[PDB]
Design a binder for this molecule. Structure first.
Ligand SMILES: Cc1ncc(C(=O)Nc2cn3ccnc3c(CN3CCN(C(=O)C4CCCC4)[C@@H](C)C3)c2C)cn1
Ligand SMILES: Cc1ncc(C(=O)Nc2cn3ccnc3c(CN3CCN(C(=O)C4CCCC4)[C@@H](C)C3)c2C)cn1
Length: 225
């Protein structure tokens, strides 16, 4: 691939990410000073587990839909056979959701954006998922310490999805090519911005897949209730 082809790939991925976010980063940052009061927190804690599930499931359904749209915008994805598109989405969509969550996490006071304001872990008490939510908060905290730029998170999340190592792929070589092109773009971009330091700091994939597995396990328990 030519330099121009690589540069265009970077810009396409980054635009695709920006245009498939639920809220713009500038909006999330502006709202950091908007923190649920003690009375509002108490109000959330009083809600039924079922209502809190509905509220979280509503948000997650939208987040997953946006990740699906992001995937469809990645060069070559829609040219893959249906099977391989599905394999990549099954393994990767919720991983991208978990990574994207860090945009809405404020490390200064350990709060997250939810339904208009920022609140801590205690907002979600009615769910009875303290261990899991703590793990999700910890993951976002570790990600926030990397200080991902908008372009970095776009390219990283593209690579979460486009991974030729996923079991069950029918056209492995085709996915290998897309993955390689994206990696070239990512490495090129990091070199240009002097940000290659982030690579060794990226979350261990075993950690991301195990957290995703635990998350999806709990989501499926709720769905069956
Ligand atoms: C034009 C157009 N028409 C329809 C869609 C669409 O239907 N979009 C979805 C949104 N969603 C929102 C929430 N769920 C969905 C699903 C189901 N998917 C179940 C498996 N998924 C997993 O994450 C588990 C699989 C096992 C591990 C986790 C995800 C990939 C989600 C689809 C298909 C999109 N565009
Ligand atoms: C417009 C808009 N854009 C982005 C966000 C966003 O990303 N916000 C969060 C970021 N985080 C970063 C780390 N943790 C978070 C949380 C905590 N959430 C607890 C409940 N959640 C469950 O999945 C339970 C359902 C039953 C099992 C756990 C998840 C939704 C995660 C939120 C809300 C919100 N709004």
């Amino acid at each position: 691939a030519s330099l121009t082809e690589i540069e265009h790939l970077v810009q396409s991925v980054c635009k695709s990410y920006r245009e498939t976010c639920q809220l713009r980063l500038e909006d999330l940052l502006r709202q950091r000073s908007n923190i649920f009061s003690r009375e509002e927190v108490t109000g959330y804690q009083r809600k039924s587990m079922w209502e809190m599930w509905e509220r979280c499931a509503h948000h997650l359904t939208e987040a997953i839909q946006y990740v699906v749209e992001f995937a469809k915008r990645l060069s070559g994805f829609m040219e893959l056979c249906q099977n391989d598109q599905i394999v990549l989405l099954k393994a990767g969509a919720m991983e991208v959701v978990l990574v994207r969550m860090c945009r809405a996490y404020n490390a200064d006071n350990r709060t997250v954006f939810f339904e208009g304001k920022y609140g801590g872990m205690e907002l979600f008490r009615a769910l009875g998922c303290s261990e899991l939510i703590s793990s999700i908060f910890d993951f976002s905290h570790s990600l926030s310490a990397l200080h991902f730029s908008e372009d970095e998170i776009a390219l990283y999340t593209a690579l979460v999805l486009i991974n030729a190592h996923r079991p069950g792929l029918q056209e492995k070589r085709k996915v290998e090519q897309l993955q390689y092109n994206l990696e070239l773009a990512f490495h090129h971009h990091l070199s240009k911005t002097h940000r290659q330091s982030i690579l060794a700091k990226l979350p261990p994939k075993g950690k991301l897949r195990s957290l995703c597995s635990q998350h999806v396990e709990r989501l499926q328990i709720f769905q069956h209730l």
